[PDB]
Design an enzyme around this catalytic site. Sequence first.
Site, PDB file in Angstrom:
ATOM      1  N   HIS A  37       8.620  15.961 -25.121  1.00  0.00           N
ATOM      2  CA  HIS A  37       7.163  16.136 -25.289  1.00  0.00           C
ATOM      3  C   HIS A  37       6.619  17.189 -24.317  1.00  0.00           C
ATOM      4  O   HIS A  37       5.470  17.647 -24.445  1.00  0.00           O
ATOM      5  CB  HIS A  37       6.433  14.793 -25.126  1.00  0.00           C
ATOM      6  N   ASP A  59      12.787  10.711 -26.352  1.00  0.00           N
ATOM      7  CA  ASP A  59      11.887  11.757 -25.851  1.00  0.00           C
ATOM      8  C   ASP A  59      12.651  12.747 -24.955  1.00  0.00           C
ATOM      9  O   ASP A  59      12.155  13.157 -23.909  1.00  0.00           O
ATOM     10  CB  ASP A  59      10.682  11.148 -25.114  1.00  0.00           C
ATOM     11  N   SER A 111       5.947  14.941 -15.594  1.00  0.00           N
ATOM     12  CA  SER A 111       6.955  14.437 -16.529  1.00  0.00           C
ATOM     13  C   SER A 111       8.242  15.259 -16.431  1.00  0.00           C
ATOM     14  O   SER A 111       8.198  16.505 -16.336  1.00  0.00           O
ATOM     15  CB  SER A 111       6.406  14.425 -17.959  1.00  0.00           C
TER      16      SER A 111
END
Length: 154
Positions: A37, A59, A111
């Site tokens: 993402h 992910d 992230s």
Amino acid sequence: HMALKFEADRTFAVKNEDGKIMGYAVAMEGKVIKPLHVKGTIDHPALAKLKFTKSSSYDMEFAKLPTEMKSDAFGYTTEHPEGFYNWHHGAVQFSGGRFTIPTGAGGPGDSGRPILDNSGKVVAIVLGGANEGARTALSVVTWNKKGAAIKTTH
């Protein structure tokens, strides 16, 4: 010879066109690994050319490291006893089966950062966090002893 380097390169910002940091990729166990993402490009001349394999159910997206980058990668460990761990922004608790941090230690752009034990091995990769007030519970990827990916989200 080109200027001598004195630090290993193994965490890499992923940036949009504007140069905003969207998240991070790591060099770990023979691969470059980043959250799927996290959208943009790695400002590294060798990594930016690679073709990534997508694994949307974790992910994750990944590619084989360039040979010259292999030695400098993180090691991973499957051992994560209850306690405290490290990341760029300070302590990461592991308790009751979840990684948590103080709320506001993170930011939107963190992230893909690793969580590390004190010996400097990676125990998990951060995907995101659920704000629960004082604490934020992290969504992470880990791998088991068979090398199998596990995504845990709260």
